[PDB]
């Protein structure tokens, strides 16, 4: 059934699993028309498909052309997500196929179950975790490849950079979720914290800066402070 705080270590066991987050698939700007009505303009999106043990990110870029002449786009977006995850699974060798796919939003369960009927032994699960994967488009290199795309494209990343050389996948996932929660709560302040010292750069082949172990502890503290500083505003507590 549902993935929660009680079964959290399951994410880092040796059973291949993927998280699927559809919150950036269908993206729009809302604007006024000449006549004073409201209209939407789609912008490029992405499916965020992540192996939390290895950091492998399958970023399927959703080009605005896939919406052309379609109706009920927020419904279609869930089905298009499930179609592309199903296509990704079928593209992987059998020994790389996931045993479980965890969807971040319950509305993805039926679309994905129906697209994966051919894979009765892949478990499709919801989660009670509130994961900040919507903030993926606050990672500059991911936002850049999505916005520049002129056609559908899959790009592969490691969202943990080289962290697994020094830390476990539990710790790497906790660092990623803290970074993304900070970027989601106050993007400007999080990016300031990540790039305030120009002597620490992002390698060409990385997403995040090349922090030493001691620098990651300082960064992680600064992100927790940012999250509590912001919470002390929202709720006036």
């Amino acid at each position: 059934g549902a993935m929660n705080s009680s079964n959290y270590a399951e994410l880092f066991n040796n059973d291949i699993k993927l998280f699927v987050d559809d919150t950036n698939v269908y993206r729009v700007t809302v604007h006024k028309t000449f006549e004073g009505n409201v209209a939407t303009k789609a912008i490029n999106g992405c499916i965020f498909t992540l192996n939390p043990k290895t950091g492998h990110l399958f970023l399927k870029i959703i080009h605005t052309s896939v919406w052309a002449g379609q109706k009920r786009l927020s419904q279609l977006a869930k089905w298009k997500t499930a179609e592309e995850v199903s296509a990704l699974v079928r593209s992987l060798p059998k020994e790389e196929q996931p045993k479980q796919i965890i969807v971040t939003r319950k509305a993805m369960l039926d679309p994905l179950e129906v697209h994966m009927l051919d894979f009765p032994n892949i478990a499709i699960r919801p989660t009670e975790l509130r994961l900040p994967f919507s903030a993926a488009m606050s990672i500059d290199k991911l936002s850049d490849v999505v916005m520049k795309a002129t056609e559908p494209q899959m790009v592969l990343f490691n969202i943990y950079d080289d962290w697994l050389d020094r830390i476990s996948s539990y710790t790497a996932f906790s660092r990623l979720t803290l970074l993304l929660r900070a970027l989601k709560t106050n993007e400007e302040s999080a990016k300031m914290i990540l790039l305030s010292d120009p002597t620490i750069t992002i390698k060409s082949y990385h997403l995040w800066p090349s922090f030493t172990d001691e620098q990651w502890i300082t960064i992680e503290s600064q992100m927790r402070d940012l999250i509590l500083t912001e919470y002390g505003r929202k709720y006036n507590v």
């Binding site: 419904q75 279609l76 499930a82 039926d110 679309p111 129906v114 009927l117 051919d118």
Partner: protein
């Protein structure tokens, strides 16, 4: 007008005959049911006074043979049997009628209720759902599971309803996943009607049989089948106009007959709300919507 004689009534029992029912006392001089209308299937059903558990009964059609009921003190139930000796049977029935030891099937002349509940139900189709080929009648009870309930355990004692599963390769064409899931017309018209049932009459017969087993025996698997066959039509954007008009009539009489006090266990809130208020057919079931809103406005 046909007769189902009883050898005796050694145990106190509530006896159902179609939508009617009568109490018989332990060792009451009761010798059966006469004036049963020819042309319809019928069901004769039992609930013992001392163990209301296991409602059970027999579907039969008096055109197919001479049937009687005899209590079996070993198996502890009223059993239907066939008498192959026409002259013995005619002689038994004449004697019991002469002594007025039989209840009369109490049909009001104006009253089409039983026809309206069994319009598409055929004994030959019942005998394929309920497999006991050596008898011309069919035993059903409260506890019997469906082939579908068994997949998700004795195969000989199962209700072989047609398996309907909205999230199944049968229901969903590769490449039409969203289309087939949100509009079940493919599944209804090609797979079920053209493929398995051959025509709407057989589909309605099974739907009507499922409802009657749900209502008369509290058979849970039958209730699931009845709602699945309603939901499959209501969830299809493309249904022939004659089938929609007939379904409205079918459901109207079923809702009319349902005991008011069993609505809570016999009606699925989600299916009826979806069918009447959200589905493609939300505006196609005028008679059904009106009786449901007036009789069961709590469920909706």
């Amino acid at each position: 007008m046909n007769t189902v004689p009883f050898t005796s009534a050694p145990i106190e029992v509530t006896i159902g005959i179609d939508q009617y029912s009568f109490n018989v006392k332990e060792n009451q001089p009761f010798h059966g049911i006469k004036d049963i209308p020819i042309g319809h299937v019928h069901v004769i059903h039992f609930q013992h006074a001392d163990n209301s558990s296991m409602r059970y009964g027999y579907w039969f059609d008096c055109r197919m043979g001479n049937f009687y009921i005899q209590y079996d003190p070993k198996d502890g139930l009223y059993k239907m049997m066939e008498e192959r000796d026409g002259a013995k049977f005619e002689n038994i029935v004449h004697n019991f009628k002469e002594r007025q030891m039989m209840v009369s099937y109490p049909k009001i002349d104006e009253d089409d209720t039983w026809y309206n509940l069994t319009e598409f139900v055929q004994m030959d189709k019942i005998r394929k759902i309920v497999r006991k080929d050596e008898n011309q009648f069919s035993y059903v009870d409260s506890s019997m599971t469906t082939v579908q309930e068994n997949e998700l355990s004795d195969p000989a004692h199962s209700l072989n309803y047609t398996v309907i599963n909205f999230k199944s390769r049968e229901a969903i064409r590769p490449g039409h996943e969203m289309e087939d899931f949100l509009d079940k017309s493919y599944y209804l018209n090609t797979v079920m009607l053209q493929g398995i049932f051959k025509n709407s009459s057989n589909y309605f017969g099974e739907l009507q049989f499922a409802f009657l087993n749900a209502m008369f025996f509290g058979n849970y698997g039958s209730s699931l089948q009845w709602h699945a066959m309603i939901e499959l039509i209501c969830s299809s954007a493309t249904v022939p106009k004659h089938m929609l008009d007939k379904l409205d009539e079918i459901l109207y009489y079923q809702i009319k007959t349902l005991p008011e006090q069993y609505s809570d266990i016999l009606l699925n809130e989600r299916v009826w709300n979806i069918c009447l208020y959200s589905s493609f057919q939300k505006n196609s079931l005028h008679n059904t919507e009106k009786i449901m809103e007036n009789k069961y406005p709590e469920l909706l």
